[PDB]
Amino acid sequence: SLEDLLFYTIAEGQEKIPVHKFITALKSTGLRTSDPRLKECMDMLRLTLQTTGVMLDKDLFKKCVQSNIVLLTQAFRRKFVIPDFMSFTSHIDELYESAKKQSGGKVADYILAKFSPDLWGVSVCTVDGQRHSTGDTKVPFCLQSCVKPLKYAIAVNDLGTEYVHRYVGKEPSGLFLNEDDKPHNPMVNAGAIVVTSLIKQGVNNAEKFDYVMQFLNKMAGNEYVGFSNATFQSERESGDRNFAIGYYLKEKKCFPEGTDMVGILDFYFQLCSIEVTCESASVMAATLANGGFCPITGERVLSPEAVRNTLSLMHSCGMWDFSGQFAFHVGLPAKSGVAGGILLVVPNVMGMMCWSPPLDKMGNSVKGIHFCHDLVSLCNFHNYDNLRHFAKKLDPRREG
Amino acid sequence: PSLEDLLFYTIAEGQEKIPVHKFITALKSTGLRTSDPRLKECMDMLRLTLQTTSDGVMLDKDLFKKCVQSNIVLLTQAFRRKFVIPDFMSFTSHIDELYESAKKQSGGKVADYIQLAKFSPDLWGVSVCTVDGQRHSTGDTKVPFCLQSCVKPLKYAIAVNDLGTEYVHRYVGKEPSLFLNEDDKPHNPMVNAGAIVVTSLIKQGVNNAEKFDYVMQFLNKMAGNEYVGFSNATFQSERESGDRNFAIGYYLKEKKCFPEGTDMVGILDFYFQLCSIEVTCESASVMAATLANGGFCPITGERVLSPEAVRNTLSLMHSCGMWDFSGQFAFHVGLPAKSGVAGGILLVVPNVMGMMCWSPPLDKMGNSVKGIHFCHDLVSLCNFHNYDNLRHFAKKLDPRREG
Amino acid sequence: PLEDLLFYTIAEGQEKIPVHKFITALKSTGLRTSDPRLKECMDMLRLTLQTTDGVMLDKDLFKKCVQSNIVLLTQAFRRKFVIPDFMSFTSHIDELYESAKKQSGGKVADYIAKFSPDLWGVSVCTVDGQRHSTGDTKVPFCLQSCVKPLKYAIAVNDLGTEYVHRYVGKEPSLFLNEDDKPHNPMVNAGAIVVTSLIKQGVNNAEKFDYVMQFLNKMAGNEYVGFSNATFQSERESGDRNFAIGYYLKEKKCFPEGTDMVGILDFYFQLCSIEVTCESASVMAATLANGGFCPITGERVLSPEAVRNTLSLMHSCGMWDFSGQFAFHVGLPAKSGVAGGILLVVPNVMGMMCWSPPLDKMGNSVKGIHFCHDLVSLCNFHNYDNLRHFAKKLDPRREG
Amino acid sequence: LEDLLFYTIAEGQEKIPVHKFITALKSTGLRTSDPRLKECMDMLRLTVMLDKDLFKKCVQSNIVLLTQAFRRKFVIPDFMSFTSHIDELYESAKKQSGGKVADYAKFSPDLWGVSVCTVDGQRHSTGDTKVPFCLQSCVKPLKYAIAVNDLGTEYVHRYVGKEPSGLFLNEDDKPHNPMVNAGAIVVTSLIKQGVNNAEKFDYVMQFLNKMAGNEYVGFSNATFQSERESGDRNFAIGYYLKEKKCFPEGTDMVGILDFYFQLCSIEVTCESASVMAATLANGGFCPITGERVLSPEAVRNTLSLMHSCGMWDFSGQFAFHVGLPAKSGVAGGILLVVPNVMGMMCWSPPLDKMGNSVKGIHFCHDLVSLCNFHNYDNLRHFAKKLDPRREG
Ligand SMILES: NC(=O)CC[C@H](N)C(=O)O
Ligand SMILES: NC(=O)CC[C@H](N)C(=O)O
Ligand SMILES: NC(=O)CC[C@H](N)C(=O)O
Ligand SMILES: NC(=O)CC[C@H](N)C(=O)O
């Protein structure tokens, strides 16, 4: 049987399995024992760890693993999207140390976004739940403009493409507005403000904010999502260009009717002050990598149409004035924000979040931007890499 | 436990003898064509044994072994449904449905400037070549027409393949759009000004006759030696009427955009020539598949282009390939593509297949009405969009799967 | 061998002149007996008409009244004013008025400003004080964007050219030019910045009072008012202007210590200042007269402020029509959305045309037609030649 | 009338020595070579002391122009005083040595000349006023004026715009104005159609001859050949206009470009060009011959477009600060018109970064800071500016 042919894969003709030897075997998969998809099995494990280490014969094991048996077998039969995760991890680690020596860039100074220039984190979450982090991946920071795809996805998920693009375009710019008196795309302030004005119309901005927070919670598999009121208050006083954009959008009747523009700006600053870590945000990115299903809970969070549209606009409009150079050389949908995050999606493989506060002169984190170039020079993750003929690039999706 | 031995019983149901037509029908249902260059030796020994045994058109397990030995590895992938699209017969009928549904779209004007860009507005063909060589066509797939601007990616690929990314893009940019960008470089190689500069990098220091022959040899390899020709009628008329291309040529000279030692008027003559190269949908679809297949021609197995050239060329087609429709196209279709004024759309679905749709009537942006309609429908049906998910794709069909 | 050497010019042999025959002769010059430069002489003339009846002036009853103003009166009667045959010129103004009166296109401004499309007036004030009006010339209307030159003139007069132009550019027209300065003071972003330089370190009530007292000097104290109705509606409908105000703040365009939202309220206020065509024509004549109000003789603006204001009106005055207008008309001009067109003919006269229905560029249909006709008739174009001008009339001439 | 100029010139003295009439004449600003004085200097070359019948025998034919001169009725009455101010202005710009000669014929950076011709024929020069140089883009007004004189405003402006640039073409696929290369090439293709370009060239030369009072107008084949070899941008503009169907039907674009290079290589001096500019200053009448050369509509349209489009990217700053119609050329000339007063030509080859002569541009700023010649100076209240049109 299934649990019986996973007991001998782990027990090497060796009668009973110590608990530490199943847990390391599991963690070697890249899964984390805190995975929400393994709770009942770790529940049954801290349950029988109270009948005091401990060692499991073939029926105590089966009593623990049957409830999660298929997820555990895909894990141990090297059937996950990256079969040799431990080797992949060391490459990610090599990449991390190589970006750490890049000291260019100036921390964002206009608010409050003066962190230390030494912070640098990278987190990975594959579409199968495999996790790895290195550096400062548990330090909270605000999403800033990396929330623009997340809220655009929510708007399309709830209302559909054709309604959303009555109000915002789908192409890069160079004006705020294009020739249809629509903002160019939802990845820029003029576009994201309009998108902010379509989410949950007909409810106050406090209930609106709760809905987006519940939505982001699903997207992160309930990992860390918070709010920084210091950044919200300080975004509010420094948002002169955003008020200019707000009034211009109102004068050009860009919003759906019944909108209170000044309130939408307040809501918009709020969404920009939402806090994440690199671990929690990399999971948000993996939901986008995984067709709308959160990879560590298995629930459908976004329509496949929402995810596709968002991945498309991140590809073409995601990195400010660097997005064309970025699309050419990196070939991955990505979104940078001014706190220094780069939300990065490798479709069908993984999502990631790099964070280092020092920005370059187009507003992208120097260390994150360096990491993304290096990552695609190593692995055939570029969108128009070939999955079969890829020269001397490494491919983490196949065996030895 | 022999390879030729257990492809014999896969095909021999009961029986120890396989009629030859029972092998040929099975072969073609995989989508391979008996003319495939990768099967030539086995097709030769099959017609030879039709000359050396008086009918009794039947293959025992050592007559089978004598014929398929040459190509047994390609043949088992075919018969073990290991090609990128295993149920090709079902997929083709979907292609056919899409063909017929675009056939009812009669908009658009045939190109008026010339010298027979005055084709019939009723010609409409689509050809498919997967990365494993499986082929299907429907409609007018054997009528010659000029590549026009569907040569811009191919020659950029040749230039990058010979010279590298970094040299080529000293001279042309890598982004969508006054002709020149902030660096007095053309915006990208998919627009006339960029393609004129790229044309001026291929095979420098050689006269325009070998320059042409060199590019012609290259397209032949990219097309697995299917039809690649040249229309001197179209060249002569592109030359007389290319007032704007001459304006671009001089502007590029004045802004020193060309390489040292370039003869501008000759480069423009070369440029019109490359625009008058002829294909069909079958031969061009194979060119598209070479780009879909990382640089290896899928029906010959030869490496034609570096994987760096193919990636660069696919990226710019994605962003700059469909004139002013390229953002809408990139959003809704999500595929690398290139339109030309003769009415072709070279189309690449990375890792699966290449296609060439051809219908002469263009819409107001210069794209074939029926081709553009065909491409929306295709991605509405199949999860080929660049950012479709290979695991969660709603009601979309996936031709890469079974059942 | 002076007051009595103008008495014989008016007295036909006769050594006694009836007052109405002096009044008729006076008004034929185009002067108004209400002219502030004639007040004393009209005072001593009504006093004499009180203290005696023989309504007749002997050679010192005349001399007792015109003594005060003898220099202006001799220039008037010796036909030394810029347009000597004013009665004939007037007759031409009337002809042009009637020909524009038959142009009924255009839509009135749709954001109350819903006036009548019937109103149509033109008033003329030469640089010597000669006046003429025809049509609806005493109806109040808001200056709207015809205040942009007047306030720029005030700012340069008080602060100088090179200070003001640290803050606003000087050339025709995305809101900001190549140097993160608005393009010129004749457009909203430029006018908002200019508004933020007038009378700094003062609350918006003295700022408004200061400009109103200034406009009064430019108008020789004819009607200058304020419409709170238009101000409230300018305040409610100014979404685009609120957008411009913030963009200017973000690109650090105001002078330090500016309250941007307050400046916008001042800006809406200045757009709601009210004039007639008569009072405004005098405002225009002040710019036409090198900075001196023509009906009081007072210096209102420095000649440098007037030049800069006239130079920018030429190039930036009529919204997107300013290139065609500068070609075909060649006169400094400024249109407003209430339907006025402030028009200056340098060295000759100022004018104010008013008709609310605007064409698609925001200019009064009738005013624009009047201005083309005027320059086809007279050699007032900036680059008409004063000696060889084909079939054009020259009103500065005694033909 | 002739007898009342005889006593005006003599102290009552006897008769008038001729050298003492010539000095009196030259002090008005008139030049004795003036074509309007041919007959009177003819009658003097026939004849050392003049009583009222030798005087009247010579001045009878020109007595009205001579009394206007001697009764101080010319546009600048105290010309000798004005002249010294021009000299001061010239000397003050002479010390501005920035700028680079155009490197696509290298003249000397030492040359610097200014010549003046009022609308009444009064002339003054300083510096290198007789050294020939090519007009380059200072022919664009002159070539536009000829076209409008012959064809009318509405025909010329089916083909060219009338507003500054800010694409070669505007919203109507017409070039922006005739003061830029794309506009001047179109203007060149309207002059004297239906005649080959050699006769076309002869005609513009005859036209420029009238505009200059038959002073020096020439042609430099060196500049023509070098314009031809260096004109890649002009060849690019030519083809773009052909594709966008901007020329009148029956145009041979490549030939028009050859004509266009020719017109830019026409040679003038500052003296002859100042007369050309004075013709524009004087409503189309040449001031040293009195003939109607251009329609008043052609001249007005030309002055309007020089004002707004004349000084390359400097035309907006220039129109504000100087307020005079002007056109600069890359050989270093600035054709400058003061409507109703005078025409001028400054020439100094070293150009600034916008393509305008450093010394000429300095002179034009200084000239308007000194005199109330700016378009929107007031003729009555002008602060401490000088007015050469008045007596004190
Ligand atoms: N790129 C960013 O993160 C900018 C966000 C910033 N709060 C804004 O809206 O202007
Ligand atoms: N766009 C096409 O398909 C061809 C373009 C055309 N041959 C040109 O060079 O202008
Ligand atoms: N009069 C006009 O042309 C516009 C005036 C108006 N108050 C504004 O600022 O927009
Ligand atoms: N700049 C000029 O005035 C003349 C030179 C110009 N490049 C031309 O010959 O067309």
mmCIF file with all atom_site columns, N, CA and C in Angstrom, chain C residues 3-4 40-41 43-45 47-48 51-52 57-69:
data_model
loop_
_atom_site.group_PDB
_atom_site.id
_atom_site.type_symbol
_atom_site.label_atom_id
_atom_site.label_alt_id
_atom_site.label_comp_id
_atom_site.label_asym_id
_atom_site.label_entity_id
_atom_site.label_seq_id
_atom_site.pdbx_PDB_ins_code
_atom_site.Cartn_x
_atom_site.Cartn_y
_atom_site.Cartn_z
_atom_site.occupancy
_atom_site.B_iso_or_equiv
_atom_site.pdbx_formal_charge
_atom_site.auth_seq_id
_atom_site.auth_comp_id
_atom_site.auth_asym_id
_atom_site.auth_atom_id
_atom_site.pdbx_PDB_model_num
ATOM 1  N N  . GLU C 1 3  ? -4.620  130.540 -24.406 1.00 0.00 ? 3  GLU C N  1
ATOM 2  C CA . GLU C 1 3  ? -6.014  130.194 -24.169 1.00 0.00 ? 3  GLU C CA 1
ATOM 3  C C  . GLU C 1 3  ? -6.904  130.969 -25.133 1.00 0.00 ? 3  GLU C C  1
ATOM 4  N N  . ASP C 1 4  ? -6.494  132.183 -25.508 1.00 0.00 ? 4  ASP C N  1
ATOM 5  C CA . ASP C 1 4  ? -7.218  132.954 -26.515 1.00 0.00 ? 4  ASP C CA 1
ATOM 6  C C  . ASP C 1 4  ? -6.693  132.721 -27.927 1.00 0.00 ? 4  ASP C C  1
ATOM 7  N N  . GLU C 1 40 ? -11.649 119.953 -13.926 1.00 0.00 ? 40 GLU C N  1
ATOM 8  C CA . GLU C 1 40 ? -11.640 121.357 -13.503 1.00 0.00 ? 40 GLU C CA 1
ATOM 9  C C  . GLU C 1 40 ? -12.324 122.269 -14.517 1.00 0.00 ? 40 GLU C C  1
ATOM 10 N N  . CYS C 1 41 ? -12.082 122.052 -15.806 1.00 0.00 ? 41 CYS C N  1
ATOM 11 C CA . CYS C 1 41 ? -12.667 122.938 -16.793 1.00 0.00 ? 41 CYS C CA 1
ATOM 12 C C  . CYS C 1 41 ? -14.164 122.698 -16.914 1.00 0.00 ? 41 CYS C C  1
ATOM 13 N N  . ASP C 1 43 ? -15.912 121.775 -14.397 1.00 0.00 ? 43 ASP C N  1
ATOM 14 C CA . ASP C 1 43 ? -16.417 122.360 -13.160 1.00 0.00 ? 43 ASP C CA 1
ATOM 15 C C  . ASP C 1 43 ? -16.638 123.861 -13.315 1.00 0.00 ? 43 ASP C C  1
ATOM 16 N N  . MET C 1 44 ? -15.622 124.589 -13.804 1.00 0.00 ? 44 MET C N  1
ATOM 17 C CA . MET C 1 44 ? -15.759 126.032 -13.989 1.00 0.00 ? 44 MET C CA 1
ATOM 18 C C  . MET C 1 44 ? -16.776 126.369 -15.066 1.00 0.00 ? 44 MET C C  1
ATOM 19 N N  . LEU C 1 45 ? -17.131 125.405 -15.916 1.00 0.00 ? 45 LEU C N  1
ATOM 20 C CA . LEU C 1 45 ? -18.136 125.653 -16.946 1.00 0.00 ? 45 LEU C CA 1
ATOM 21 C C  . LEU C 1 45 ? -19.554 125.477 -16.407 1.00 0.00 ? 45 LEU C C  1
ATOM 22 N N  . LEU C 1 47 ? -20.178 126.027 -13.242 1.00 0.00 ? 47 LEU C N  1
ATOM 23 C CA . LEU C 1 47 ? -20.268 127.151 -12.319 1.00 0.00 ? 47 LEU C CA 1
ATOM 24 C C  . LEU C 1 47 ? -20.715 128.400 -13.052 1.00 0.00 ? 47 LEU C C  1
ATOM 25 N N  . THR C 1 48 ? -20.181 128.611 -14.244 1.00 0.00 ? 48 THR C N  1
ATOM 26 C CA . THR C 1 48 ? -20.566 129.756 -15.041 1.00 0.00 ? 48 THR C CA 1
ATOM 27 C C  . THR C 1 48 ? -22.007 129.629 -15.514 1.00 0.00 ? 48 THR C C  1
ATOM 28 N N  . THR C 1 51 ? -23.863 130.903 -12.392 1.00 0.00 ? 51 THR C N  1
ATOM 29 C CA . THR C 1 51 ? -23.731 132.315 -12.065 1.00 0.00 ? 51 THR C CA 1
ATOM 30 C C  . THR C 1 51 ? -24.113 133.244 -13.222 1.00 0.00 ? 51 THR C C  1
ATOM 31 N N  . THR C 1 52 ? -24.725 132.721 -14.285 1.00 0.00 ? 52 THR C N  1
ATOM 32 C CA . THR C 1 52 ? -25.542 133.494 -15.229 1.00 0.00 ? 52 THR C CA 1
ATOM 33 C C  . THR C 1 52 ? -26.235 132.512 -16.160 1.00 0.00 ? 52 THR C C  1
ATOM 34 N N  . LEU C 1 57 ? -19.859 132.478 -24.102 1.00 0.00 ? 57 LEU C N  1
ATOM 35 C CA . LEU C 1 57 ? -18.510 132.606 -23.572 1.00 0.00 ? 57 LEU C CA 1
ATOM 36 C C  . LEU C 1 57 ? -17.793 133.702 -24.345 1.00 0.00 ? 57 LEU C C  1
ATOM 37 N N  . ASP C 1 58 ? -17.412 134.769 -23.645 1.00 0.00 ? 58 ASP C N  1
ATOM 38 C CA . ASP C 1 58 ? -16.568 135.793 -24.237 1.00 0.00 ? 58 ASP C CA 1
ATOM 39 C C  . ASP C 1 58 ? -15.114 135.349 -24.122 1.00 0.00 ? 58 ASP C C  1
ATOM 40 N N  . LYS C 1 59 ? -14.194 136.223 -24.518 1.00 0.00 ? 59 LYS C N  1
ATOM 41 C CA . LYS C 1 59 ? -12.813 135.781 -24.651 1.00 0.00 ? 59 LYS C CA 1
ATOM 42 C C  . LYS C 1 59 ? -12.089 135.541 -23.322 1.00 0.00 ? 59 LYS C C  1
ATOM 43 N N  . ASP C 1 60 ? -12.649 135.934 -22.167 1.00 0.00 ? 60 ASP C N  1
ATOM 44 C CA . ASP C 1 60 ? -12.113 135.395 -20.915 1.00 0.00 ? 60 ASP C CA 1
ATOM 45 C C  . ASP C 1 60 ? -13.068 134.475 -20.157 1.00 0.00 ? 60 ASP C C  1
ATOM 46 N N  . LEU C 1 61 ? -14.372 134.454 -20.461 1.00 0.00 ? 61 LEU C N  1
ATOM 47 C CA . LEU C 1 61 ? -15.144 133.382 -19.841 1.00 0.00 ? 61 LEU C CA 1
ATOM 48 C C  . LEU C 1 61 ? -14.646 132.045 -20.362 1.00 0.00 ? 61 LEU C C  1
ATOM 49 N N  . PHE C 1 62 ? -14.393 131.971 -21.664 1.00 0.00 ? 62 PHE C N  1
ATOM 50 C CA . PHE C 1 62 ? -13.645 130.860 -22.226 1.00 0.00 ? 62 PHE C CA 1
ATOM 51 C C  . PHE C 1 62 ? -12.290 130.714 -21.546 1.00 0.00 ? 62 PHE C C  1
ATOM 52 N N  . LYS C 1 63 ? -11.539 131.810 -21.443 1.00 0.00 ? 63 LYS C N  1
ATOM 53 C CA . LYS C 1 63 ? -10.176 131.719 -20.928 1.00 0.00 ? 63 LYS C CA 1
ATOM 54 C C  . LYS C 1 63 ? -10.155 131.319 -19.458 1.00 0.00 ? 63 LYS C C  1
ATOM 55 N N  . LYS C 1 64 ? -11.220 131.647 -18.717 1.00 0.00 ? 64 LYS C N  1
ATOM 56 C CA . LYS C 1 64 ? -11.329 131.284 -17.304 1.00 0.00 ? 64 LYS C CA 1
ATOM 57 C C  . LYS C 1 64 ? -11.575 129.788 -17.109 1.00 0.00 ? 64 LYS C C  1
ATOM 58 N N  . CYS C 1 65 ? -12.176 129.115 -18.099 1.00 0.00 ? 65 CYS C N  1
ATOM 59 C CA . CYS C 1 65 ? -12.529 127.702 -17.987 1.00 0.00 ? 65 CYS C CA 1
ATOM 60 C C  . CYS C 1 65 ? -11.484 126.769 -18.581 1.00 0.00 ? 65 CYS C C  1
ATOM 61 N N  . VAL C 1 66 ? -10.947 127.095 -19.759 1.00 0.00 ? 66 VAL C N  1
ATOM 62 C CA . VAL C 1 66 ? -10.006 126.208 -20.421 1.00 0.00 ? 66 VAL C CA 1
ATOM 63 C C  . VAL C 1 66 ? -8.576  126.433 -19.944 1.00 0.00 ? 66 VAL C C  1
ATOM 64 N N  . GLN C 1 67 ? -8.348  127.425 -19.084 1.00 0.00 ? 67 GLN C N  1
ATOM 65 C CA . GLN C 1 67 ? -6.999  127.754 -18.633 1.00 0.00 ? 67 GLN C CA 1
ATOM 66 C C  . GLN C 1 67 ? -6.323  126.536 -17.992 1.00 0.00 ? 67 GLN C C  1
ATOM 67 N N  . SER C 1 68 ? -7.107  125.718 -17.269 1.00 0.00 ? 68 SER C N  1
ATOM 68 C CA . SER C 1 68 ? -6.642  124.608 -16.448 1.00 0.00 ? 68 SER C CA 1
ATOM 69 C C  . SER C 1 68 ? -6.124  123.447 -17.259 1.00 0.00 ? 68 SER C C  1
ATOM 70 N N  . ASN C 1 69 ? -6.652  123.317 -18.462 1.00 0.00 ? 69 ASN C N  1
ATOM 71 C CA . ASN C 1 69 ? -6.517  122.146 -19.316 1.00 0.00 ? 69 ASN C CA 1
ATOM 72 C C  . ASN C 1 69 ? -6.146  122.550 -20.738 1.00 0.00 ? 69 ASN C C  1
#
